[PDB]
Amino acid sequence: AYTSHLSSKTGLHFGRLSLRSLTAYAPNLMLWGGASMLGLFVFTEGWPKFQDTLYKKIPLLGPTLEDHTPPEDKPN
Amino acid sequence: AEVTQLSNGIVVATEHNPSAHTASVGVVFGSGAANENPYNNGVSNLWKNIFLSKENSAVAAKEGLALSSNISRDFQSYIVSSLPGSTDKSLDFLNQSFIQQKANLLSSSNFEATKKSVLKQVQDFEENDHPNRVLEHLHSTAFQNTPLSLPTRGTLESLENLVVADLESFANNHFLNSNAVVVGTGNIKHEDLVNSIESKNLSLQTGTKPVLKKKAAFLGSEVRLRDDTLPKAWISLAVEGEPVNSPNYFVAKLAAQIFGSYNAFEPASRLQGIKLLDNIQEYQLCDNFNHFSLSYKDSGLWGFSTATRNVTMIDDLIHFTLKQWNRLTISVTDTEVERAKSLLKLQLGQLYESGNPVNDANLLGAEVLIKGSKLSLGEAFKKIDAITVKDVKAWAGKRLWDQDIAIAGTGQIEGLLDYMRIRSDMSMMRW
Amino acid sequence: PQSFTSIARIGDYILKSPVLSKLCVPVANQFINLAGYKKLGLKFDDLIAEENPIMQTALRRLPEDESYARAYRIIRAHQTELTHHLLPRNEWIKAQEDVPYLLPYILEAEAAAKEKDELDNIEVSK
Amino acid sequence: PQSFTSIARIGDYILKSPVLSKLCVPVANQFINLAGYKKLGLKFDDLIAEENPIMQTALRRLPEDESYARAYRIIRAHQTELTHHLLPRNEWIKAQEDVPYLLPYILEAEAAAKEKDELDNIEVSK
Amino acid sequence: VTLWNVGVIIFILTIATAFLGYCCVYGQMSHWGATVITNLFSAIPFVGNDIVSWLWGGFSVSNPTIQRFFALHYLVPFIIAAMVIMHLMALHIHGSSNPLGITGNLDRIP
Amino acid sequence: SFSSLYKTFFKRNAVFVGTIFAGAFVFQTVFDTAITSWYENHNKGKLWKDVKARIAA
Amino acid sequence: KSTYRTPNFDDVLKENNDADKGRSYAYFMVGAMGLLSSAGAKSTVETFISSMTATADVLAMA
Amino acid sequence: MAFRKSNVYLSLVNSYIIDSPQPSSINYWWNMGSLLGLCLVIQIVTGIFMAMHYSSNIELAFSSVEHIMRDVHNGYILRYLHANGASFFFMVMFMHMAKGLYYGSYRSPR
């Protein structure tokens, strides 16, 4: 028939932030969290605790990080 | 609605509208300024203006006929409009002076006066009309060394080498039965137009137009015709867009309608539902803009044009509108698509459904000439209503996100940054 | 940071109540008297912080004579506080003179901005 | 910071002498050729340093077509040396084309400034 | 608000500077203050022992810790001077407040 | 297919810098191993484990 | 000459102007520079942090 | 306007290193200033990380320098980097000054 009005809604927002932009931006900042976690995996590679807990269980880059210096040629 | 038939050599297209008070017939060829060299540039302008000479138009005025013509990139039309009872006086005029007996039009002392006024016309175009000359320079730098790079009016250096031999050579090569649609709009009926175009045995010419050896290729480039003695700064900026018979034709029209047009001095143009206005209004970055989607046969253009007097903050105007373009790829909303749908349906309705049957003749001629028929307005509306947000995001990831651009500017464009900063604005670093 | 529509909403609910007004408006009158802005020749709408766009539009929409009187009351309060005195008791603002004069302009600008963001985050039912 | 009146005085005394003009002008022409500003498409008056009020008045009083030609020659010189090439040999500024065009404007602005500073330190003979 | 936040950064840096400078004199409160405040950081359940062994330069507060604390107790004051220049820059855009809390744009004094 | 390559590696900046960091990780590890094996092989018979295996026989 | 007649850029233009090909060729080189710069930056900041761990004589008297 | 201009500090960063208009014709001799700034950062950082281990008495200066060279990790990198970086600093500074003396950078506005 003939439209006399405009039935609308507002939804949810708190200023500049909506939920529609949160839906549009959610998977790419999941990817950003993954990217900076890989950056942490870079920047803590010389750390020994993160080596012996995380970086030496890689199936081909595991034995690359350790010494097997014998317990014979180091003073401590 | 539209009906379109094919005679012995001529295709005839009518849009009959029985509540009109003028009828309008004419012939639309299929070779605009994209079928010229850089050396005969301006031949179609000279044919437009010798069809509208004073001695050619006096003969039409004595019979109550008003002449009109249009030079574009792809097509060119020659339209004769009159009262509804006198359609055959118009067909007779268009035949006996443009089609067959064009030796009185191409008189010397008529060619000289028309060439002189066309030279004066393009000389006053090149130095007074600033937004359109930067749209022509955007075309001439986006499509350079390909045939779509030619100005439709021609060039002052090109136009003063033209003679009548060039006009009749172009006439032989392009004014053909294989290249032409005979249009009729207003309240002329189709059966009467075909019966009077087979009543007279109207035949234009019998050859076939030359096929161009290279297609139009978009080259990301820039041109800066800077002039510090002008008050404003006029900047057009565009990417390669969709040509006609795309599947993304209406998606490009809708994506230009999302950002719309704006005028700083109209109070209902400041209250639009564009999210660019509450970035460019706080320091009054521009006077106006308009987002276009120009579609041609080979290629297309999609972009915007602005005029601004804030010559110190041009780069932030460009930066804010390109960061608004990025939202089409990433975060365009449902509401912007619905608003642009309604505004695009309104804009197409005002373009096609208008009272003037000269404009309907130009539109029907170019459309039927390029794709053999004409899409109705109801089918156009059903193709606009089917666009989703994913279609806009897919189109903008294809054509907009991190693509080369073409820039043209005149005026005080010292504040306009170089190609590389503007091109690096075309894709944000996902924030 | 609490916008004046909320303050006016709570205040109208208090003043339109028979019990709540007769308990709370004496406490508010004593609060206003203890606050002591009137002793420096200031009405309360000279006290509101003006460095947001809402109050900048309200001060721009305030008429000419009210703005000149507001500027004088502000300059007088600065000169009074510079000397660590008060104003003489005939120059104090009285209770009938302490009128809310900026409050309709603030309420209009706030309703305009609230409708603006509600129509920027508009969503259709299709 | 040598004033052009000094340069013009020494140069005119050189050029109007019979002997040392015919000695000193060939070494000057060889100096001009070895300088190589013409190979970048520049006349010599584009080379004068312009960040002083004398040259600012001379460039303001320079006519409009000469200023556009000078601006293009400067922009072309910057674009040429940005690519570490020279201009092609048909685009070099020829010797009859290397005219002093800014020199009368510089000389009249310098004479005006020297007359101004002589009048500011004037002493009446009483 | 950016002036307040640059102030909070300056406050954190001055607290750190004075703690290091009190640790440089190496008295009895100096040493044991250094040990309890640095052994605070062993409460972090994954990397706490290694960040406290990186702070100490060894295994408890001794010669590497004291030479470290001197180099840092020099250094952090010049970071404080840079942050004070930034404090003044953030102040200067809007100017200082006044005890009335009303605008001070109407009469002003050089 | 350069289009699919672009759209999965260079379109979003997040996956671009994530690929840069993952490549820096594996590059650092295998580059250190390659340089240390070439260095120990170029100095053969001069290292301490060579001298120790010689005096252990 | 006109201003609609663009000069000769043919000595520097590439004859196949694919968008994805040229863009991925540029971004592979700037990504390689980012990769080597990130590895070098990690190793230099871990050099400066490892110069603060302990010292060999403290580890001797451990 | 853009946030890199609207901010207090980011407009300083913008106005000096981002939007700063440089003449297009300047050659590689104009990189010596950025080079000297990098040199200064190198000297300051390596000097702090060696002053964490340096002792300045007449008895312990030399042997603390060899304590840096011998038993602190990557200490030879720090000392050779500081010493050769000071020498490279002076070479680049001589190039900066000789560029300024060649191209007339000392003249009337500067």
Ligand code: HEM
């Ligand atoms: C080294 C330390 C500091 C110095 C030199 C410093 C300097 C100044 C100066 C000179 C002023 C202007 C005069 C004044 O208003 O009193 C000022 C104002 C101010 N400082 Fe600080 N400050 C320091 C620390 C701090 C701290 C720790 C804070 C709070 C976290 C802070 C917050 C402020 C604020 C809010 C103002 C504005 C006050 C106003 O004028 O209304 N400052 N500072």
Ligand code: HEM
């Ligand atoms: C302006 C920049 C600097 C220059 C040019 C400079 C120069 C030098 C030089 C030439 C040496 C002697 C190196 C040698 O011959 O072995 C030296 C030593 C030293 N410098 Fe600096 N220096 C600078 C900055 C700094 C700073 C900021 C610090 C402290 C934070 C510092 C700490 C030292 C120390 C501790 C030594 C001790 C001896 C050594 O380890 O070499 N330097 N400096």
